[model samples]
Target: PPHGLLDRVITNVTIIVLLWAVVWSITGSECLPGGNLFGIIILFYCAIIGGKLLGLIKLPTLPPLPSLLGMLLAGFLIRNIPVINDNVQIKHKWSSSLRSIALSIILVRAGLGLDSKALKKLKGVCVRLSMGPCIVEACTSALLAHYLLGLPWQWGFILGFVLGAVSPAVVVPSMLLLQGGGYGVEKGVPTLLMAAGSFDDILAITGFNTCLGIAFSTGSTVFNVLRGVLEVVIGVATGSVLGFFIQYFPSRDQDKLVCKRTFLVLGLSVLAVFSSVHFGFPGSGGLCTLVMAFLAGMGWTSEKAEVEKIIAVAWDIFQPLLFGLIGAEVSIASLRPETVGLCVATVGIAVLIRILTTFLMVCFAGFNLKEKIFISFAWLPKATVQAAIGSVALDTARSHGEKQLEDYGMDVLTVAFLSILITAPIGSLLIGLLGPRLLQKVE
Candidate 1:
């Protein structure tokens, strides 16, 4: 009993630290300037201390939601009552830039997580499944933004891509939760969800990049549009070439095995995308890394296993921190009345769109309604990716050298957060409730 109480408390503390601290650090100095950065360091130390204390606690813990609820309650106590406070200044350019860079780099990292062989294996299926919802959602969101939301067509396209992409971070963990509950299979569910979500974000980014070009100029001149297509093709070609070479060789030393190879590939992948982006080259970033991961998974040479293992390690450590930082970026009070209402309405609209597409996909993919519903329901959650894309659109727009322009970026940031807070948890809950019945139907 003593151990049980202590364990519960430890679990609660870790959840709080992981979710909010990582979130705060990423948005540090941006959301609450005084609090975000300093808060991150403080929270890091607290997490370390609390983690050690948890080691001593010796008990089984609550499940995901319960743990989330407990930590949120604790956070509410600290934040709501002004005990710690949310007095952080919102740094516009710096915060937006920091997040943009991080998010852009993550795409490369995600790409590094893939390889040619795996892509070859799953590419056709994943792309087919992903494209259905993506295309529909993109079109739906674009129309809604332009007509219903009364935004410019350019901005609407940007918003459609931004809101349409499902959050990979949220999807991965949520899948794990289902796996833990024994509702989702070890093979089909995990693999498809990860691949589909990964590709879904890729499609959204591709559209976002294209829309960014359109928004910047009067329209996409053939050159810019051509450049965008080239970016993807060239980016993938370069990454593929790099992956091919890496696979062609053996690591020179033991220490240079998995960890070194993994980090090296990931770093190179990010640098490739970053450089390509700056130099106006074509890309989705992470082409090399993704190719490497896929190749490694498919048993291509050059210690692919070691590299994926390393990438997986980074994913394990990086994601919770990422999500937590995302949560911290959310200041509930900043939610304007209209923004709050829009977020709610966006969910219904997004849901309605997903349902329509899900039915279409089920018919096309040859799945029954239940399976289609589960698949689509599984995806409706949004996360940091929405914010990342929104930030990108806003940043590109602001940097367009237009004068006296309204603060277009901040407005987008507000909208992204509204969508994220509403979508992630609700999607998670629905999946939890409906997973079992659907999974049974899948087989």
Candidate 2:
């Protein structure tokens, strides 16, 4: 407790507290929410430092993607071997459902980034490129799920849809970098991303619901295809209506109110999602949250100006924790040699899918081959969204009654995790090297 040394001692103590909390979480020792929140802060700091350093080095720098994967590997290594497993065990599926809801809202705000102005300017292209590719990607993935994974239609559909969906965290920045560097035409970068990434997820989530129906069925099918269809219709309807409503309000007063509104409602909404599963719906309130967030961003109130900043702050704070948890939750010991091989194979398949999807959409829209390839590679890295869907599958497996679902769920998840780990960096590197050429040559 002497002079300046006290600060160092205090810092050391804080580190000790963080380590203990992490160990406790992994070992399934429940603690206060405060501990979880504190752990989140510690995790964020680590992510920022690591994320920045990786970006600085320019080695396939996708901030959230690598940070998440690295943290996951660290956690995996700590929990896998007997020596460390004895001290720290990963509760892989435990916090996943909780985390997923937040992730869903995060994504919705990301969707909100396609502002009224962008939507207005790119409306036709969004339809031709965004809407079209998403539909194809989702349907294609569903077929693969049924045939390749031997999954039920519902389960297969979900996996396929998930696979089809792109990760915005990876897409947004990469495109910005490309566009800024004149790797692509001025407007080409954002247009490709907003269209491809956004619609693709819409396709993926819809397919996932269809697949879930078959996967969750007791071999006595109910007519969930109708219900799933309705949900999408309703969700989009809800998002659009809400977006317009928020857009109608005054910007300043709404801005002041949104912080409080977000704090209060986001948690309650997640809890609502938790409770819904008990009522036998798709259960998670994510789709609803997403819609609401979109509405908020679009002008449901006058908070439009403030919406971006709010979402930005929330994303920055939570993103790192999300990544850290991803690292902590994966058990590398569970990965078989075949799984590794399959992971590699899936990457190639995903890339082929991207190439085909991007090419058809762009070419149809009057874009040159140069534009098509640049857009394709730019959209390559599938990170958070894939992993998030996979995490949900893991949770369903661990908690569901069916043995087949349990095993296949885990396998699909691990495969997805491995896919993200390998492909994100490769895609980043590809974009860094190839993006300029495509941009420069595009007619």
lDDT computed for candidate 1 = 0.56
Summarize candidate 2's per-residue lDDT along 22-117 as a digit string, tens digits: 766775534333344444444445555566555555455443244444544544444356654444332435456636655655555544444455
What is the lDDT of every predicted structure here? 0.56, 0.57
- The 10 consecutive residues of candidate 2 with the worst lDDT sum are 29-38
Q: How close to the true structure is residue 329 of candidate 2, measured as C-alpha lDDT?
A: 52
Q: Write the per-residue lDDT of candidate 1 for residues 1-443, one digit (tens) a residue.
A: 45878889898779866766677667755434365455444333333333333333432252234122222233233333454555532234444444334444454334433334434454556766677777887777767666545677777766677777777655555565555455644225545565565456556777777776776665555665566566557656776677666654644545656655655566666566567657765335534445544443444444454554555555544443344345545555544455546645654686689767866664554445676677877777777677556566555555666752234444456667666666676676667667776775223
**Superposed model 2: Cα runs more than 4 Å off:** 1-69, 78-94, 101-105, 108-112, 115-117, 121-159, 173-188, 195-199, 212-222, 248-307, 391-411, 428-443
C-alpha TM-scores of all predictions:
0.69, 0.69
Candidate 2 — what's its lDDT?
0.57
Model 1 quality (TM-score) = 0.69
